[PDB]
């Protein structure tokens, strides 16, 4: 145990003896974006209970949402039309994902099961095609790699890589102490980051199924994790009204985005197409847009209840926000 | 919408909105309940009497043409504060205690303290069930005491307005109401008049728990409405 602490001190010291200059010193010589005005352009209605998750499609037009009454709805964001309405076996759903090819959707919650729904059948109905079982805790997140591979996060401190064709886990990702809350994929789908309630974030390798790096610094647990468009940075969000931005290669903590006027925690985080903006949904009914380079508050997206999820279109077109009052708003 | 296909899409959306309306009226007339308890408590037998590693279980019972949905949380971890945020909209919480062990009581007390003082559990009233009372009666007449665990039991008298059973032995009563108070002391120290507690004395062979839940729910909703209309 004594040796362990040594090592940890060696690792710290190695990290310490690298911070020659913070982001602010370099970035203090760039003109800011200034003020950004975003207006509500659409309003999607039809959900009964609170909304827990949403996910944009690569088509940049369709999106899927999940609510606590046990319903999945697929919208058309241009004409405000509804394409599909899917009921769930269990009403306590917590997450949903949309396939990159637009062929499948997934969901899960307080039932230890991840369900797969096929959207393209000969019959004009949506039916479940695979139920993934084996987790001990509730499912908190899920993301498709392709039409055959999916990564899930559970409340049993473990992650897993599944095989939809057979339904058996091919890799188990153990090591977290507390239950895991969120995960994020990489553009090349060779790595993924994950954050848990033990106030630590870890980087995993999909092929070798092994932990690679660890990040610390957050005072409270982690609720939402996002990834930089370039591929080398990722930003988190905690319950202590703070969000950071950690590098991969540098292995440290960069500029911190927080203010003294916020007491409530963060629920969702997302990035802009260029990485010039950082938007996060807070518990004070509001959404805060920040300058990702200078830690400047620029714009507020002002919902009558808690904001639960966010989403930015692939081409930077617009932003969709969900909330606990069962309304979806599109800002452009 | 100036094409035939667009009109057909709008029509499909309209059908979807009519299905969602019937779902909403079905939904508005149901009351949701959450059941919490330990392994020694007979919570697993009350569900049986009323009626794989899964995560949650459901049970439906009807009284006076009113539907009640009780959700029992199954195979989960030992941490509760994270998934308890999804139940801030239920009518009431049923808490089952096996107060016939003399050992497994303090942990139940801290459990009750943690549940009652939760942030996300405000406005939610709790119905207290005291189970396996006949075992307590069989464990007290022989004389395993209570003063060795609770030293203040020796300074407790039967409260003034208690009602004993008809075939009651004098002794049993003192212990039952001591446990009931011990549980009731926790609720009265906080809440500032937004939720209440409804204790009971439940046995293994009972056929009235549904009626008690109905009455407690009726009282809770009536009190909620009276406060809302500035009458309380």
């Amino acid at each position, epitope marked *: 145990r004594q040796e362990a602490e040594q090592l940890k001190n060696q690792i710290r010291d190695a990290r310490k003896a690298c911070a020659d200059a913070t982001l602010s010193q370099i970035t203090n010589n760039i003109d800011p974006v200034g003020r950004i005005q975003m207006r509500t352009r659409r309003t999607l209605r039809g959900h009964l209970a609170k909304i827990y998750a949403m996910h944009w499609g690569t088509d940049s037009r369709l999106l899927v949402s999940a609510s606590q009454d046990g319903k999945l709805i697929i919208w058309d964001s241009y004409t405000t039309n509804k394409v*599909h309405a899917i009921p769930l076996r269990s009403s306590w759903v917590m997450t949903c994902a949309y396939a990159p090819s637009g062929n499948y959707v997934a969901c899960g919650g307080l039932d230890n099961i991840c369900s797969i729904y096929n959207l393209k059948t*000969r019959e*004009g109905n949506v039916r479940v095609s695979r139920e993934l079982a084996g987790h001990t805790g509730y499912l908190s997140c899920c993301r498709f790699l392709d039409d055959n591979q999916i990564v899930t996060s559970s409340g049993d401190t473990t992650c897993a890589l599944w095989d939809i064709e057979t339904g058996q886990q091919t890799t188990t990702f153990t090591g977290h102490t507390g239950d895991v809350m969120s995960l994020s994929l990489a553009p090349d789908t060779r790595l993924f980051v994950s954050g848990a309630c033990d106030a630590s974030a870890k980087l995993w390798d999909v092929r070798e199924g092994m932990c690679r790096q660890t990040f610390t610094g957050h005072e409270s647990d982690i609720n939402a994790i996002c990834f930089f468009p370039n591929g080398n940075a990722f930003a988190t969000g905690s319950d202590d009204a703070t969000c950071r931005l950690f590098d991969l290669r540098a292995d440290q903590e960069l500029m911190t985005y927080s203010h003294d006027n916020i007491i409530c925690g963060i629920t969702s985080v997302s990035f802009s197409k260029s990485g010039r903006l950082l938007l996060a949904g807070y518990d004070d009914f509001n959404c805060n847009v920040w300058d990702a380079l200078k830690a400047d508050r620029a714009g507020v997206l002002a919902h009558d209840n808690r904001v639960s999820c966010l989403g930015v279109t692939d081409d930077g077109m617009a932003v969709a926000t969900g909330s606990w009052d069962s309304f979806l708003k599109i800002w452009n | 919408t100036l*094409s035939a*296909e*667009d009109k*057909a899409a709008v029509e*499909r959306s309209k059908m979807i909105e009519k299905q969602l309306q019937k779902d909403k009226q079905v939904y508005r007339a149901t009351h949701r309940l959450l059941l919490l308890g330990a392994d020694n408590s007979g919570k697993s037998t009350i569900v049986k009497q009323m009626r794989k590693t899964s995560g949650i279980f459901e049970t439906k019972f009807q009284v006076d043409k009113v539907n009640f949905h009780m959700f029992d949380v199954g195979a989960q971890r030992d941490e509760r504060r994270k998934w308890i945020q999804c139940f801030n909209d239920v009518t009431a919480i049923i808490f089952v205690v096996d107060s016939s062990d003399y050992n497994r009581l303090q942990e139940a007390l801290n459990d009750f303290k943690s549940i009652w003082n939760n942030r996300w559990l405000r406005t939610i009233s709790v119905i207290l069930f005291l189970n396996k009372q006949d075992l307590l009666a069989e464990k007290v007449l022989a004389g395993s005491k209570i003063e060795d665990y609770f030293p203040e039991f020796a300074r407790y008298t039967t409260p003034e307005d208690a009602t004993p059973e008809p075939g009651e032995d004098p002794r049993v009563t003192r212990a039952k109401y001591f446990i009931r108070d011990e549980f009731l002391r926790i609720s009265t120290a906080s809440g500032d008049g937004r939720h209440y507690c409804y204790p009971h004395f439940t046995c293994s062979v009972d056929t009235e728990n549904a009626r008690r839940i109905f009455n407690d729910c009726r009282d809770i909703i009536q009190r909620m409405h009276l406060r809302q209309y500035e009458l309380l």
Partner: single-chain antibody
Framework: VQLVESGGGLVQPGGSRKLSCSAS????????MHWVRQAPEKGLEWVAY????????YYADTVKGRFTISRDDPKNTLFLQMTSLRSEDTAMYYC??????????????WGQGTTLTVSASADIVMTQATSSVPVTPGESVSISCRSS???????????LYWFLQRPGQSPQLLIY???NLASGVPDRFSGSGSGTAFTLTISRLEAEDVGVYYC?????????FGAGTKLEL
């Protein structure tokens, strides 16, 4: 997924018949239904249309007060009611599925049809350049279609279809909305156009590509077809 049609027969003039199409194997209560006519020596022609919710109904301008459509969801049966059979209703009638949402592929599955022998305007005009062409098994083929009004819509869609009924079976779907490929068709067909004139190209050539190719527009409701170009190998 299979549909069955019933009725048919020979009807004396002035009679009335009840033609029907029966669905089975899918969610029939979510698909719009059409009826399409086809004379023995002419191309296809659209008859009527009923929607999934029975709230919308169209009829062809030729017959609007004579025919009548109805549907039954609990039994999955579609009906066509014909009265005062003239000397023209001597063609083949087909029942066609269709479902309308974003990204969908209407006019996908056709039935098998029936026969009916009878004893003795401002709509878009769609025409095809030729009627037949001789080719070789392995060369490139190009079939042209033209319209009288611009099929391109303000949204960005071009409502043009290719069907290519084979010599002996019911029609199927090759290209929908002038650019997109059907589900099970081989990946050697393609389509292109500019807004008024369109072409269908077949890169390779197999023995299964013989038949008559059709050109249909779905901009307005009349639903006018083309003429047809037979290929002989």
């Amino acid at each position: 997924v299979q549909l069955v049609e019933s009725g048919g027969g020979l009807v004396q003039p002035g009679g009335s018949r009840k033609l029907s199409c029966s669905a089975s194997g899918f969610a029939f209560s979510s698909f719009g239904m059409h009826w399409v006519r086809q004379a023995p020596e002419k191309g296809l022609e659209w008859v009527a249309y009923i929607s999934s919710g029975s709230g919308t109904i169209y009829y062809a301008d030729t017959v609007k007060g004579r025919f009548t459509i109805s549907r039954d969801d609990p039994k999955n049966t579609l009906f066509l009611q014909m009265t005062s059979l003239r000397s023209e209703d001597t063609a083949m009638y087909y029942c066609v599925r269709s479902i309308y949402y974003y990204g969908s592929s209407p006019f996908d599955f056709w039935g098998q049809g029936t026969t009916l022998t009878v004893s003795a305007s401002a709509d878009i005009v769609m025409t095809q350049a030729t009627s037949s062409v001789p080719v070789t098994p392995g060369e490139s083929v190009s079939i042209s279609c033209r319209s009288s009004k611009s099929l391109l819509h303000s949204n960005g869609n071009t409502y043009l279809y290719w069907f290519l009924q084979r010599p002996g079976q019911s029609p199927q779907l090759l290209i929908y909305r002038m650019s997109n490929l059907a589900s099970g068709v081989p990946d050697r067909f393609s389509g292109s156009g500019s807004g008024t004139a369109f072409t269908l190209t077949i890169s390779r050539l197999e023995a299964e590509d013989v038949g008559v190719y059709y050109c249909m527009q779905h901009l307005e409701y009349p639903l006018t077809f083309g003429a047809g170009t037979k290929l002989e190998l």
